[PDB]
Design a protein around this ligand. Structure first.
Ligand SMILES: [K+]
Ligand SMILES: [K+]
Ligand SMILES: [K+]
Ligand SMILES: [Mg+2]
Ligand SMILES: [Mg+2]
Ligand SMILES: [Mg+2]
Ligand SMILES: [Mg+2]
Ligand SMILES: [Mg+2]
Ligand SMILES: [Mg+2]
Ligand SMILES: [Mg+2]
Ligand SMILES: [Mg+2]
Ligand SMILES: [Mg+2]
Ligand SMILES: [Mg+2]
Ligand SMILES: [Mg+2]
Ligand SMILES: [Mg+2]
Ligand SMILES: [Mg+2]
Ligand SMILES: [Mg+2]
Ligand SMILES: [Mg+2]
Ligand SMILES: [Mg+2]
Ligand SMILES: [Mg+2]
Ligand SMILES: [Mg+2]
Ligand SMILES: [Mg+2]
Ligand SMILES: [Mg+2]
Ligand SMILES: [Mg+2]
Ligand SMILES: [Mg+2]
Ligand SMILES: [Mg+2]
Length: 484
RNA sequence: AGUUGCUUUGACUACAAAACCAUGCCUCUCUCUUGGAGCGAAUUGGAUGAUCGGGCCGAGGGCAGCGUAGCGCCUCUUCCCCUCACUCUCCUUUCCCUAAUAUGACUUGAGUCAUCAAAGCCUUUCUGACUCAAAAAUUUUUUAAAAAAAAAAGUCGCGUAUUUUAAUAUCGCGACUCUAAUUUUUAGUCAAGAAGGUUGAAACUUCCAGGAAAAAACUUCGAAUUGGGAGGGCGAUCCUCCCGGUGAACUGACCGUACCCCAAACCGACACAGGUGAACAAGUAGAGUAUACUAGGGCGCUUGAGAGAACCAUGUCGAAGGAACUCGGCAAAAUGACCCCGUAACUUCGGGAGAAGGGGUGCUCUCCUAUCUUUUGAUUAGGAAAGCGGCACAUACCAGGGGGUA
RNA sequence: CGGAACAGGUUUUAGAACAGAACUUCGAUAGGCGAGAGGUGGAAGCACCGCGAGGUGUGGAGCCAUCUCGUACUAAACGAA
């Protein structure tokens, strides 16, 4: 067409790619490794792409959390002659701050031309400040925008209110609503969502009703499914059931595009509301809308059925998932493992655990966490320490360190007190050294009573000075000084 | 010396949505590319009930030709096909509406902005995935010992009976497809990155005239400083092996650096039209670094105002004639480019030769070919063919006079 | 002839400077403006024909080195010098 002359179907195959770049980079899947491999293969080739094609590929990569390939594509395409606009510079500033850190984003903003330091790049840097939970730099940049007569849109106000709600100072949001209404900046739907979230955060349920009433009477913001999802979440957490039913029915009515996330919200909010038939109806609607249902929807649905005490239905849906899964996700298997171990059916959970790695899903720290929770609840410590070692050695899936919960360690040390197991207590302390460094409160401050079986260790109050000093209770040094 | 490389390559699409609550274990575990559940219609469907009409088969008595069984004729309604209603739970074809199909909704009018080491090779080095390899795990076979090996699911089909009814299961089989698992470790490969160096900066071919030196630098080897370990030692800090041995959040002294440098600053007595290495040097026309014009950068040349005689210098043009000029065609004029045709005497067979002599050349349209067209259903180059304008189409600039004979 | 002749200014049929000749405001000396002659040869704009290069009409069109005529608008006595 004349309005869109750079057609991606009719373009020459000698100069350009045979397929769109946002299809080419996701040819082998949406994983980070495959996308980086496809980007490396594309950048070594001789076929070219459009500017809007690169922009669409960057926006598609941003929506899936692939910030490094988006930043690499933007930088290499800019180095090859694709000149950035101010909007592209704001997008690139956000990409730099997402992939390399906020200091690199500030360095990119400083090195920008002075004519490129406009409302778009200022708003992008403000959003990057608000996402990183830095209130001082966000307030300083907002005051700098107000000083230089740079217009603060509703998006920047929304980012500031989200920062206030996430930090804990949610009382400042209703002041910011009137501040926004003072400068004739009109709210969007997210403004009302974060406003009702902040009003529910200050233990004011009745404030949500005037927000939705004035949104209806505003006449310039059309409600969507996220507004009713926010209302339904507020009503479910507040204990109100009928208003949650009305909000979820409105969410179903407003979900005209059959969004996957809205279906997850519907399934989980009916799951927390306890209505099983509504859960099954939403599941049938989702399976109608998504003929090849992904692992995330099964992971939510089977967990909801387990929570609502429908174990044969959860088993049937798990068997249906097992026969159609392209990737054997371990989280769906962990749902059934937790369901079996919480009900004492350890044989089925052990069968699932011993048959899962051949099916394609290696065990993570959550599987061993469920098993050690079962062993702690049953009272067996030797089998629990093995699962603790397995979960510590596996670690978290995002690269972090896995540690047992405080209550579980407290219960396990209480179990070691009764059987006078000094060796098991020392092994648990060794694992807690291997996991963290502080480990001081109730972990071994009153747990010197485990030593009251046969003798005591050498250092005689010099051991408790090594782990950055721990102070024991006043009733614990009596038997400690008795054995010196 | 000649080739092949070094020789730049792209974008122009207008776009802050990147700000989120449920669950959470890295919650899209990897979603690139799926039409609608419209209270929307028309031919069709049907989960339904009767009436009328038509048509087999069939039923008995018979008129019928046998000792059983007949061929035409005569009374009947089931069963099926239709029709009027009830009707949305299944199928077929199309239309409307809504969704999606990449954002938003004149100045490349011959430009602007980027880029200007890409691609390789060699050392390391962090992290992933796969592969063994190998051992420890269990079964079979062979003689407690040795050899070979599967483990988990989905789909199709066959023969056979167990519930207080989740029998879509349990019993044995034949076939197909998919996955690699408990622990330990090596060696490897790929993948994704981070530090160094190094090549590109030259390679090949041919030729004769046969194309620097240097314990400088570099690679190697030896010995090794003020170091750290492991075994001998009736010893004296001795002997033999191993690692390190120029390493860095050490330090890198001294001298030049202004300014001119085709020039008014250097060599010429001058602020002198002379002389003064190499490197870089955008665009259009062009074979070109020729030549014309040109931005950028630099400069207007350190005497001017008038007048527009002779004469002198340097240029433009010139009737008719065309070397009669003169020592002599001196000077000038002329020729001049590319493509095509054509090219003599003579010759040492290499030449002569661009011999000489001729023709065409602009623009527009349309075909044909190709350009080894990185926007291939329209652009450049070449050729045909038909037209258009002028005195003139190598239109300016640039750019052989030719022949005969001593 | 006797406040004559010069000089100055605008010029030119004259001219190296000088000299000559014309005119010097009750003035056409030069410039300008207007008209005509003369040269060139058919402007622009618009319309029509053609795919196009281009062609046709409006229309001896448009333009102006010179020459003549008209005309004090400017400079020559604007010399209340
Ligand atoms: K110099
Ligand atoms: K020139
Ligand atoms: K003169
Ligand atoms: Mg040496
Ligand atoms: Mg200098
Ligand atoms: Mg001299
Ligand atoms: Mg000099
Ligand atoms: Mg000079
Ligand atoms: Mg030349
Ligand atoms: Mg030149
Ligand atoms: Mg200039
Ligand atoms: Mg001078
Ligand atoms: Mg003269
Ligand atoms: Mg003549
Ligand atoms: Mg003549
Ligand atoms: Mg002649
Ligand atoms: Mg003569
Ligand atoms: Mg003579
Ligand atoms: Mg003579
Ligand atoms: Mg001559
Ligand atoms: Mg000449
Ligand atoms: Mg041509
Ligand atoms: Mg005179
Ligand atoms: Mg006059
Ligand atoms: Mg005439
Ligand atoms: Mg003209």
């Amino acid at each position: 067409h004349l309005s869109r002359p750079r057609d991606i179907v009719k373009r020459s195959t000698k100069k350009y790619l045979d397929e769109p770049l946002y299809h080419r980079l996701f040819k082998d899947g949406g994983s980070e490794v495959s996308v980086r491999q496809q980007l490396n293969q594309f950048l070594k080739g001789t076929k070219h792409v459009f500017k809007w094609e690169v922009g669409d590929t960057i926006k598609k990569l941003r929506s899936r959390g692939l910030y490094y390939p988006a930043l690499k594509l933007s930088e290499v395409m800019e180095h090859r002659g694709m000149n950035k606009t101010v909007s592209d510079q704001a997008i690139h500033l956000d990409l730099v701050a997402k992939a390399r850190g906020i200091a690199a984003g500030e360095s990119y903003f400083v090195d920008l031309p002075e004519t490129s330091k406009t409302e778009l790049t200022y708003a992008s840097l403000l959003n990057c400040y608000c996402k990183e939970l830095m209130t001082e730099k966000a307030e300083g940049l907002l005051n700098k925008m107000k000083e230089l007569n740079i217009t603060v849109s509703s998006m920047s106000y929304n980012s500031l209110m989200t920062l206030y709600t996430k930090t804990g100072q949610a009382e400042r949001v209703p002041g910011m609503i009137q501040e926004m209404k003072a400068e004739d900046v009109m709210p969007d739907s997210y403004t009302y969502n974060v406003w009702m979230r902040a009003l529910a955060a200050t233990e004011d349920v009745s404030g949500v009703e005037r927000v939705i009433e004035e949104m209806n009477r505003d006449g310039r913001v059309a409600p969507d499914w996220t507004t009713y999802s926010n209302m339904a979440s507020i009503y479910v957490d507040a204990g109100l059931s009928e208003k949650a039913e009305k909000a979820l029915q409105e969410l179903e009515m407003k979900n005209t595009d059959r969004d996957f996330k809205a279906y997850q919200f519907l399934i989980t909010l009916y799951g927390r509301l306890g209505k099983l038939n509504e859960v099954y109806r939403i599941w049938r609607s989702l399976r109608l809308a998504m003929p090849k249902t992904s692992n995330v929807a099964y992971l939510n649905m089977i967990q909801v059925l387990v929570n609502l005490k429908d174990l044969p239905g959860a088993e049937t849906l798990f068997k249906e998932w097992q026969a159609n899964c392209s990737t054997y996700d371990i989280r769906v298997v962990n749902v059934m493992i937790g369901a079996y171990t919480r009900e004492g059916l350890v044989e089925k959970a052990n069968e699932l655990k011993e048959k899962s790695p051949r099916r394609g899903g290696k065990l993570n720290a959550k599987t061993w966490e469920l098993f050690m929770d079962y062993y702690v609840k049953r009272g067996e410590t030797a089998q629990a320490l093995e699962c603790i070692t397995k979960a510590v050695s596996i670690g978290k899936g995002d690269g972090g360190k896995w540690l047992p919960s405080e209550d579980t360690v407290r219960a396990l040390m209480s179990q070691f007190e009764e059987k006078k197991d000094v060796n098991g207590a020392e092994s648990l302390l060794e694992i807690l050294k291997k996991g963290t460094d502080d480990v001081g409160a109730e972990t071994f401050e009153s747990l010197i009573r485990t030593y009251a079986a046969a003798g005591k260790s050498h250092p005689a109050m010099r051991q408790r000075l090594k782990m950055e000093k721990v102070k024991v209770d006043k009733a614990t040094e009596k038997l400690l000084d008795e054995l010196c």
